[PDB]
Design a protein around this ligand. Structure first.
Ligand SMILES: NC(=O)C[C@H](N)C(=O)O
Length: 287
């Protein structure tokens, strides 16, 4: 039996209070794109000279960034979003190199300038905005619960005292830490590890973005998604705090794909399990 390396039963801790200052900073507002093509091209000249866009992501999130078992290629919604940025830089999307990063390493790789962008289901938060920059929102998810079809778990309070899996370094862990009385919290490196743990009955439920959970359901249709929206998860492209030019550039790409049909095509390609495509998230700008 496969045992995913890195599984930890976390020490019992008192519930954290829900923090109401979380929206103080208006986290989803970002920087307006450049008005001229020449300004935008200048802002990515260093990337262009390096010959490829270096993108941080992983292979642990089915539907978002994973290795296709048939073609062997890294693919998914997040891969395709990153490829549209590369298309804007290079003219075609294929000039991308990946740096494999866990959820807990997304901020550090940006701080250390180890990638140009992170496209890895990265929720935009005020705490993260103290450390990195973000594009406007490219997909809006919400934290829910995944359990086997025969499980009685249907609401948040059912998680108390039960074994709930979360990946380390995620907003999902922070939300589960609010539950009173606490679940038994089992943490792992990536969300695919939570699926293995549930398949082996080493946990009782998984809680994270409904988008990610839908990817797990696609791999294991014995599971289903239950419960209310537990916490908004607005995804942004993560960028080094000081590279404001790249923020504006990526926001230009997002304006393009929201309006030229590409975003709709990518949603239909990857996410129809969640329902018919909504309108793309409306961008918000500070300036
Ligand atoms: N694994 C994830 O990305 C979960 C959540 N979107 C986060 O930003 O932490």
């Amino acid at each position: 039996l496969p045992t995913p390396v890195g599984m930890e039963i976390m020490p019992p801790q008192p519930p954290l209070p829900p923090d109401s200052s979380s929206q103080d900073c208006d986290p989803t507002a970002s920087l307006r794109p450049f008005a001229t093509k020449a300004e935008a091209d200048a802002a990515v000249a260093d990337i262009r000279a390096r010959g490829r866009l270096i993108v941080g992501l992983d292979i642990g999130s089915n539907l978002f960034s994973f290795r296709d078992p048939i073609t062997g290629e890294i693919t998914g919604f997040d891969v395709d979003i990153a490829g549209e940025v590369a298309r804007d830089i290079f003219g075609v999307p294929s000039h991308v190199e990946y740096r494999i990063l866990s959820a807990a390493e997304r901020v550090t790789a940006l701080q250390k300038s180890q990638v140009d962008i992170v496209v890895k289901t990265m929720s935009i938060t005020c705490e993260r905005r103290k450390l990195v920059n973000f594009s406007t929102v490219y997909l809006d998810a919400n934290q829910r619960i995944l359990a086997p079809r025969d499980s009685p778990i249907t609401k948040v309070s059912d998680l108390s005292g039960k074994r709930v899996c979360v990946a380390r370094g995620t907003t999902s862990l922070r939300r589960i830490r609010e539950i009173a009385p606490p679940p038994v919290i089992v943490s792992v490196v990536n969300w695919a590890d939570c699926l293995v743990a549930l398949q082996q009955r080493e946990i009782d439920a998984v809680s994270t973005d409904d988008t990610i959970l839908a990817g797990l359901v696609e791999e294991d249709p014995y599971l289903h998604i239950v419960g209310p929206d537990m916490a908004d998860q607005p995804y942004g492209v993560g960028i080094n705090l000081d590279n404001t030019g790249l923020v504006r550039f990526v926001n230009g790409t997002l304006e393009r794909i929201r309006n030229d049909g590409t975003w709709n095509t990518l949603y239909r390609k990857w996410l129809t399990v969640l329902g018919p495509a909504p309108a793309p998230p409306t961008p918000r700008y500070v300036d």
